[model samples]
Target: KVFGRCELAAAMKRHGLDNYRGYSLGNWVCAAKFESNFNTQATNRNTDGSTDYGILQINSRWWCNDGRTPGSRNLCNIPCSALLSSDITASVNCAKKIVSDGNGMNAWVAWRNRCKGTDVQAWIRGCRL
Candidate 1:
């Protein structure tokens, strides 16, 4: 897991994710914090048996395939395991596409419940970027 806010900021910038779509870096960071606490290997199982994968906890029902589940919409066309990596290139790319799908940050329930309409400067504070 990444240990520093500055390190995460630098990595996001290098991946062209500093400000994706209309969302700011703080938005992404805050969402990540709430979703998976920035742990790439994080996974959560839903009551319905679907799972959320990676730092974003992307849902298998709609975003990616987990293989065990049937009827995976797999909009990102990626395996769920691919998101569980220290290298976030694929995950970020998938997230960008998710945002473009008209849901904006609301695609993440964590973003809506925690990050949205809230003061999120702390997410980027001391990043030195």
Candidate 2:
């Protein structure tokens, strides 16, 4: 499913990502735009042979058990394909786990390159809540 700015923000908020670990909802909105453009099935492969999965492009190297990332920690305790589903509830929780692991939102390169230090609130301007 492709989610709009407000819809993603609203869904994530409901899933407990709002102001999670001091990162604003807009940070997530902005990051997703660059990471996957709100496309739930997005996938990208890294040069290191790890796959990135889902809207937020969670990497298999350390997060999900893709059964491919050489040093997979399986921290999220789920399969990488799980993030590709329409239900982002699992993906959102995985993102929270990513942040809580001390990586913060910067775990996503898109977030660091696109959302960080920017006024991401502008990204959600017309989106109500």
Candidate 3:
């Protein structure tokens, strides 16, 4: 599970994401397809004129700690892209934590809740208070 679609799918399964209920994983895949076309080497030009790199186009040079730091895999690029290929769950977890650091989602703020433990599925639905 080191390269390509098969590997990526395998990684998702290994991370216990094979059960694609509530269109969670499906929605995620759709978002990734549009955001980065599922390309690990994908990038996006930021307002600062710098390029965001990789799937999720993570700008790791600064968002390193909070964001995905696939570093060497990112080749020290301008925007250190996230290596979603290496670990999709890490990327998703980071996204969740970053976007939900006590400040709940505006759309889901009314549904105030917190995830129990490592069950991401529970967090996704339950946290939508």
Candidate 4:
């Protein structure tokens, strides 16, 4: 699914990502934008042979199992494919696990690269909360 900024924000809100774990609602939105540009089918392969799946571009090495990461712990206890669906329920919940596991939002380098220190308020300004 190719989601607009507001549409993605609304969908993420439905899954309870808003301000989750001290990050603002916009923080998640911003990370998603930079990670996968709100495309649910998005998948990226890492240099280490791990793949990132779905809108949040979650990694397979530590979060989701893909049968290829070798060291995959699947701490989210979900298949990597689960993060590819447009529903985002699995990805959102897995993201929470990723966050709560340790490092918080820093789990995604994209957040620090593009979202951290940025004024994210406008990312959701036009969307209805």
The TM-score between candidate 1 and the true structure equals 0.92
The pairs that clash in candidate 3 are 53-81, 110-129, 111-129, 112-129
* lDDT for each residue of candidate 3 in 1-129, tens digit (9 for 90 to 100): 123444444444556544433234433433444456667666566555545545545545444332443342332322243444454655554444434444433212212222212243432242211
Best by lDDT: 4
> Over the stretch 1-129, how does candidate 4's per-residue lDDT look in tens digits?
899999989988998999888888899999999999899999998999999999999998888889988867788899999998978899999998888877988889999888889999879997877
What lDDT does model 4 reach? 0.90
Can you tell me which runs of candidate 2 are displaced by over 4 Å? none
Give each model's clash number.
0, 0, 4, 0
Where does the lowest 10-residue lDDT sum fall in candidate 1? 1-10
Ordering by lDDT: 4, 2, 1, 3
Where does model 4 exceed 4 Å of error? none
User: Whole-model Cα lDDT per candidate?
Assistant: 0.83, 0.89, 0.42, 0.90
- TM-scores of all predicted structures: 0.92, 0.94, 0.45, 0.96
lDDT of 1 by residue, 76-119 (tens): 99999998989988788888888888889999988999999998
RMSD of 4: 0.9
